[PDB]
Amino acid sequence: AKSRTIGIIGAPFSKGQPRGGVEEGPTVLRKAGLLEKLKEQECDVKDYGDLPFADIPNDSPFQIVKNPRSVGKASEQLAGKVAEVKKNGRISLVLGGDHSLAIGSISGHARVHPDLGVIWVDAHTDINTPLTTTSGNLHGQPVSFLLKELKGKIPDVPGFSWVTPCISAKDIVYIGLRDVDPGEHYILKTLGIKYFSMTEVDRLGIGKVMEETLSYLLGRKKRPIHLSFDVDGLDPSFTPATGTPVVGGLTYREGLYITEEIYKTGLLSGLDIMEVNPSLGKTPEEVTRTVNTAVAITLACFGLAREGNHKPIDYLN
Amino acid sequence: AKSRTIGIIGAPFSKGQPRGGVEEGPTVLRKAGLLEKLKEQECDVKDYGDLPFADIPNDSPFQIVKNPRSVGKASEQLAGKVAEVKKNGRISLVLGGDHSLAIGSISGHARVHPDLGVIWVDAHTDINTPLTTTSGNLHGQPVSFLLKELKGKIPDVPGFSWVTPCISAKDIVYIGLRDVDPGEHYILKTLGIKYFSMTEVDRLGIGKVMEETLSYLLGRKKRPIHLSFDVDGLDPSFTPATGTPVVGGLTYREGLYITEEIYKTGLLSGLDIMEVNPSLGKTPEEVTRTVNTAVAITLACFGLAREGNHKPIDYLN
Amino acid sequence: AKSRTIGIIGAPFSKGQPRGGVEEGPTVLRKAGLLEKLKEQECDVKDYGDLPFADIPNDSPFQIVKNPRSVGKASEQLAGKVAEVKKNGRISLVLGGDHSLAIGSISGHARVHPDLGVIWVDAHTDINTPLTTTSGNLHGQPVSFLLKELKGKIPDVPGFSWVTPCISAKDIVYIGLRDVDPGEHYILKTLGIKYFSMTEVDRLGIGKVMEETLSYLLGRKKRPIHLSFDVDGLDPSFTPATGTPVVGGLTYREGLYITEEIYKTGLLSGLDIMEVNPSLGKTPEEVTRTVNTAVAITLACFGLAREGNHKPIDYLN
Ligand SMILES: CCc1nn(CC)c(C2CCN(C[C@H]3CN(CC4(C(=O)O)CCCC4)C[C@@H]3c3cccc(F)c3)CC2)c1CC
Ligand SMILES: CCc1nn(CC)c(C2CCN(C[C@H]3CN(CC4(C(=O)O)CCCC4)C[C@@H]3c3cccc(F)c3)CC2)c1CC
Ligand SMILES: CCc1nn(CC)c(C2CCN(C[C@H]3CN(CC4(C(=O)O)CCCC4)C[C@@H]3c3cccc(F)c3)CC2)c1CC
Ligand SMILES: [Mn+2]
Ligand SMILES: [Mn+2]
Ligand SMILES: [Mn+2]
Ligand SMILES: [Mn+2]
Ligand SMILES: [Mn+2]
Ligand SMILES: [Mn+2]
């Protein structure tokens, strides 16, 4: 089954954001029994392991932008693993780690199937450039490096030598937005990027959001799709354990309809479950809750449906 | 009126599942003044009573199915009293208890009104047969015994000799589904049954779920509606005190929107308020919350409109 | 932008209801940083201070209606300040306080912009007369005092000597209602008032709720809109520290979309955030959650979008 054949790349990286603990994301997500869960849900799973990041001493900030040589090397080494997975014939699955690893994820994937479309589930567009960036964090700057349109506006940041924009503006849709920087709104609006903030979902409902999202992305031909889900795109009552929570976002049901719908397209070929920090929870249940939501979102992507699932065998005999 | 004339049945029985305290559902709902409140909403109310359940010594299982004679005679006791209430020109209001009681509830109702239409608001389909069951719980098997299409596909289980199936596959709608077993999903597809799982609610909104449902059950002509309401159909953040709770489901608002709509037709003729377990509270407020949600649902079945209610008199006089 | 020039008036008035603490509403709304967050949002924020509401001891009640002289005095004082703000080209931002002050705000707004249409976002209709009312609390009687059609159904009550009904029973739309008295529902129907109870918000989504609200009042002409908002309209899970909390109301995201589509018109002239009682939250966090949501409600009515908000400059320079 193509839609059930997966390559599990675990990326324990955190130098893209200023809070420790997001590196233990792969670990906690694996302890919840996702490998076995996907295997009990008729899946062809194979684990590639955690990618190691041999510490980079001497990594002075590029202006205000912190940890550039580390953010880059981790994405360039992951980009090699995603390409190596896609060649083995499997849907790449990147467990983060911080969302700056999306540069590597989309990059390696795009090396095999350059015609990819991107659905981005996040509260923040994460579309900042090292010049527009207000915080300096590279986890909120992945999208600027990947757009063919922003070249010339993207400066020479140490560690990003390898980067060649692989996605054009027309090939990425936003869902769940509610925390956008002024500079990010300029990029969103002036580039003409198909966005659906929380206002959009409140007006149409996730049904019409996915109706327009899969038509906008797959209108002409059925090309492969890369889903870059940052768990802060959901409401902090479902994913409380995360670096940047913003209240009033996607509900548990909403997160399941997005993933259940993209599965039915039969074109999911890359997935990212980013920004899961297990040591950023106010109580143990906020941690369990977060991982249970991130694991449920994952199973919805690879076959799980709420109406039920059955095999081609007679159950009434 | 024929919509506010009620026959209050109590059903203190829990032997349909492995978690005790659900036999204390008819007690607690009555403590929270369910009857006092209905008479205020201008309801002609009668109390038939909380049914006494004959204690079967040594209830040997039928294969992996636990307590078959107890469920078999408790539902047979209900059927006789449901037929009585329905024949006394009254709308049955069963207070459970577990869902295995829907055998006698629907059977009793179809003796007076054989053209009955069933709306099942519940997280589970409960359509397992005594062979396709895996949990062995009889609260997950009613719809199978009740269905005519499964004749020959149900074995001789002790206590169900009196059982004459009375519903057709096209005489039932599902609303809330999210925890389905392969065998249960299989029968739903191979029997052409109309199901609205959480995916369908997330897609179409509770307005179109209630739109599609009523135009479907009352197609060619007007007929009587039997709403079997399990409080787990709603999210366990509104109904925690329940046996098999599943996260991210029907809201306290959607559950009300469904019930308000069946009242507006004036054809609700059979009601089941199932799976209320006050012994499954984790703070006395979660029982108080589950029981408040149960009374809000029922009051809405008899005209408790959220837009307002008034007597047919001049109020500016 | 004229939908950015603001005038702040803070009513520490609480004698319109039994629960004490609603008088500290504008002070807690000032510590949170209302003016500061608006100035960032590019607003012309000029404070008009706090109103000096004198004590009226021995204020005898009129029938079941308590503190009538004090309420009429408070709104008469507010009608004159709201008028000065309206005459200076500023949006009247009134910070309550209880919902009785909506007599003074809407009258003060009708003295300058008399062709205004109202949107009552509440959990209750607030349309009780000094006779029909069952509580005798004036924070639930403002609308009927302002209706021209109910000229003759309001008796001579001490303090409201100045009152002349300014709005018609057609220049108003209700939203989020789920606790409407029999007398309140009688007025709503035998007057034909546009309403969006919680039943319609569940039926048509908040998107079609706003197309139907905004068309019903802004069809023929681009007329001034006054939003008399009560935090009890939003579910007690979002604004819990309020006097009359009603479960199953508007969410954070529905209350944000409402205020977002109202800014988009550019016809907002008045705004009233009412009933934030900081002494009515079980935990200190419940107080914070009621206030943060009120701030989020206000800021959305003056430009704050979820998609982003940039200035008219080139972010790539
Ligand atoms: C509930 C609603 C709400 N309540 N509040 C707080 C009262 C907000 C605010 C939450 C925070 N944003 C500021 C941060 C939003 N940006 C996001 C990111 C980036 O581009 O760097 C970082 C995460 C990924 C993308 C970075 C920026 C920042 C952060 C640190 C330093 C700095 F100079 C600027 C302001 C609004 C909201 C959302 C409207
Ligand atoms: C992400 C949410 C989630 N997390 N998990 C846990 C990883 C679940 C699971 C919850 C349970 N279902 C299966 C049980 C639910 N079935 C239904 C019922 C029946 O007919 O017996 C029982 C309730 C009424 C109808 C019986 C079955 C069962 C139960 C016990 C033993 C047995 F062998 C089979 C598996 C998934 C979910 C819901 C999707
Ligand atoms: C689902 C939760 C629920 N559980 N219950 C209890 C079974 C209710 C009821 C709660 C109370 N309402 C009536 C009160 C609501 N009114 C409106 C207001 C007013 O006029 O003062 C309140 C604030 C502004 C508008 C005044 C009235 C009142 C109040 C005091 C005394 C008196 F005699 C009547 C009936 C339903 C609900 C709401 C469905
Ligand atoms: Mn992100
Ligand atoms: Mn994010
Ligand atoms: Mn059930
Ligand atoms: Mn169930
Ligand atoms: Mn009010
Ligand atoms: Mn109110």
Identify whether the C-beta of residue C176 lies closer than 8 Å to the C-beta of residue C227: no
**A153: its two tokens:** 């506006």
Identify whether the C-beta of residue A67 lies closer than 8 Å to the C-beta of residue A61: yes
Looking at the complex, does the CB of residue A127 fall below 8 Å from at least one CB of chain C? no
With vertex at residue C6, the alpha carbon angle to CA C252 and CA C82, rounded to the nearest 5 degrees, is: 100
3-state SS of chain A is CHHHEEEEEECCCCCCCCCCCHHHHHHHHHHCCHHHHHHHCCCECCEEEECCCCCCCCCCCECCECCHHHHHHHHHHHHHHHHHHHHCCCEEEEECCCHHHHHHHHHHHHCCCCCCEEEEECCCCCCCCCCCCCCCCHHHCHHHHHECCCCCCCCCCCCCCCCCCCECHHHEEEECECCCCHHHHHHHHHHCCCCCEHHHHHHHCHHHHHHHHHHHHHCCCCCCEEEEEEHHHECCCCCCCCCCCCCCCECHHHHHHHHHHHHHCCCEEEEEEECCCCCCCCCHHHHHHHHHHHHHHHHHHCCCCCCCCCCCCCCCC
Beta bridge partners of A119: A173, A227
Interface mutation target, options B198, B208, B209, B282, chain A, most CBs of A under 10 Å: B198
Atom of ligand 3 nearest to the CA of C133: 20
Single out the residue of A260, C313, C27, C188 nearest to residue B202, CA to CA: A260
Active-site annotation holder among C23, C76, C98, C99: C99
3-state secondary structure (DSSP) of residue B119: strand
Identify whether the C-beta of residue C101 lies closer than 8 Å to the C-beta of residue C227: no
Chain A partners within 8 Å of B207 (Cβ): none
Active-site annotation holder among B260, B272, B275, B286: B275
Q: Which domain holds residue C210?
A: 1-317
Judged on CB neighbours under 10 Å (0-12, 13-18, 19+), A1 is: exposed
Beta bridge partners of B118: B172, B226
Distance CA C25, CA B66 (A): 59
Q: If you search the block for the tokens 């397209």, which residue do you land on? A: A265
Ligand 2 atom 27: residue of nearest CA: B135
Give all strands of the β-sheet with A47-50 in edge-to-edge order.
A47-50, A6-10, A91-95, A268-274, A225-230, A117-121, A172-175
Length of chain A: 317
Please name the amino acid found at residue B257.
Answer: Y
Distance CA C148, CA A262 (A): 55
Please name the amino acid found at residue B114.
Answer: P
How far CA C104 is from CA of A200, C45, C83, in Å, comes to 36, 21, 10
Distance CA A118, CA C189 (A): 50
Beta strands C44-50; C5-10: pairing state:
parallel
How many Cα atoms are found within 13 Å in the side-chain-facing hemisphere of B3? Answer: 16
Q: What are phi and psi of B38, to 5 degrees?
A: -65, -45
Distance CA C307, CA A185 (A): 7
Distance CA C18, CA C5 (A): 35
Length of chain B: 317
3-state secondary structure (DSSP) of residue C17: coil
Distance C124 CA to ligand 8 centre (A): 6
The bound ligand whose nearest atom lies closest to the alpha carbon of A247 is 1
Distance CA C299, CA C43 (A): 10
In angstroms and rounded to an integer, the radius of gyration of the C-alpha atoms of chain A is 18
Distance CA A248, CA A123 (A): 9
Is residue A125 a known part of a binding site? Answer: yes
**A50: its two tokens:** 């955690």
Atom of ligand 3 nearest to the CA of C99: 24
Single out the residue of A232, A183, A194, A206 nearest to residue A118, CA to CA: A194
Which residues have a Cβ under 8 Å from the Cβ of C194 and sit 6 or more positions away? Answer: C170, C172, C173, C174, C213, C216, C217
3-state secondary structure (DSSP) of residue C10: strand
Identify whether the C-beta of residue A224 lies closer than 8 Å to the C-beta of residue A267: yes
Query: Would you please indicate which residues of A are annotated as catalytic (active-site) residues?
Result: 99, 122, 124, 126, 139, 230, 232, 275
Distance CA C184, CA C199 (A): 17
Contact pairs from chain A to chain B, CB under 8 Å? 75
Q: If you search the block for the tokens 């109904």, which residue do you land on? A: B239
Chain C partners within 8 Å of B260 (Cβ): 199
* Residues lining ligand 3, Cβ inside 6 A: B 296; C 124, 126, 128, 133-135, 137, 139-140, 179, 181, 244, 246-247
Q: Name the minimum distance, in Å, from the CA of B123 to any CA of chain A.
A: 9
Beta bridge partners of A5: A44
Query: Does residue A20 have a cis peptide bond before it, meaning omega lies within 30 degrees of 0?
Result: no
CB of A181 within 6 A of ligand 1: the answer is yes
Cβ distance C248 to B311 less than 8 Å, yes or no, reads: no
Please name the amino acid found at residue B117.
Answer: G
Length of chain C: 317
Distance CA C218, CA C212 (A): 10
Method by which the coordinates were obtained: X-ray
How many Cα atoms are found within 13 Å in the side-chain-facing hemisphere of A289? Answer: 19
Which residues have a Cβ under 8 Å from the Cβ of C225 and sit 6 or more positions away? Answer: C116, C117, C118, C119, C217, C218, C262, C265, C267, C268, C269, C270
Domain count, chain A: 1
3-state secondary structure (DSSP) of residue C205: helix
**A188: its two tokens:** 């969103």
**A256: its two tokens:** 């399941």
Distance CA C24, CA C11 (A): 9
**B253: its two tokens:** 């608002």
Q: Is C185 a catalytic residue?
A: no
With vertex at residue A202, the alpha carbon angle to CA A197 and CA A203, rounded to the nearest 5 degrees, is: 100
3-state secondary structure (DSSP) of residue C179: coil
Beta bridge partners of C173: C119, C194
Is residue A136 a known part of a binding site? Answer: yes
What is the enclosing helix (H) or strand (E) of B28? helix B25-31
CB B311: neighbour CB atoms within 10 A?
9
Chain C partners within 8 Å of A191 (Cβ): none
Please name the amino acid found at residue B309.
Answer: N
| Exposure string for C164-176, b = 16+ CB within 10 A, e = fewer | ebbbebbbbbbbb
Single out the residue of B255, B302, B294 nearest to residue B276, CA to CA: B294
Single out the residue of C144, C157, C152 nearest to residue C183, CA to CA: C144
How far CA C46 is from CA of B70, C4, C19, C52, in Å, comes to 75, 11, 31, 18
Identify whether the C-beta of residue A46 lies closer than 8 Å to the C-beta of residue A10: no
Cβ distance B316 to C186 less than 8 Å, yes or no, reads: yes
Distance CA B245, CA B89 (A): 35
Single out the residue of C237, C240, C248, C247 nearest to residue C202, CA to CA: C248
**C162: its two tokens:** 């100045």
Interface mutation target, options B253, B262, B292, chain C, most CBs of C under 10 Å: B253
Single out the residue of B75, B138, B87, B81 nearest to residue B112, CA to CA: B87
CB A203: neighbour CB atoms within 10 A?
20
Single out the residue of B147, B123, B83, B104 nearest to residue B13, CA to CA: B104
Identify whether the C-beta of residue A270 lies closer than 8 Å to the C-beta of residue A224: yes
Query: Residues of C forming the annotated binding site for Mn(2+)?
Result: 99, 122, 124, 126, 230, 232
Distance CA C98, CA C102 (A): 8
Query: Does residue B97 have a cis peptide bond before it, meaning omega lies within 30 degrees of 0?
Result: yes
Distance A124 CA to ligand 1 centre (A): 8
Query: Residues of C forming the annotated binding site for substrate?
Result: 124-128, 135-137, 181, 244, 275
Identify whether the C-beta of residue C78 lies closer than 8 Å to the C-beta of residue C97: no
Judged on CB neighbours under 10 Å (0-12, 13-18, 19+), C115 is: exposed
Active-site annotation holder among B23, B50, B124, B171: B124
Atom of ligand 3 nearest to the CA of C17: 21
Single out the residue of A176, A175, A190 nearest to residue A225, CA to CA: A175
The bound ligand whose nearest atom lies closest to the alpha carbon of C242 is 9
* Residue B198 CA from chain centroid, whole number: 18
3-state secondary structure (DSSP) of residue C204: helix
Cβ distance A260 to B183 less than 8 Å, yes or no, reads: no
Distance CA A124, CA A135 (A): 13
- Enumerate residues 221 to 250 of chain A having a beta carbon within 8 A of any beta carbon in chain C: 247-248
Atom of ligand 2 nearest to the CA of B128: 20
Distance CA B102, CA B118 (A): 11
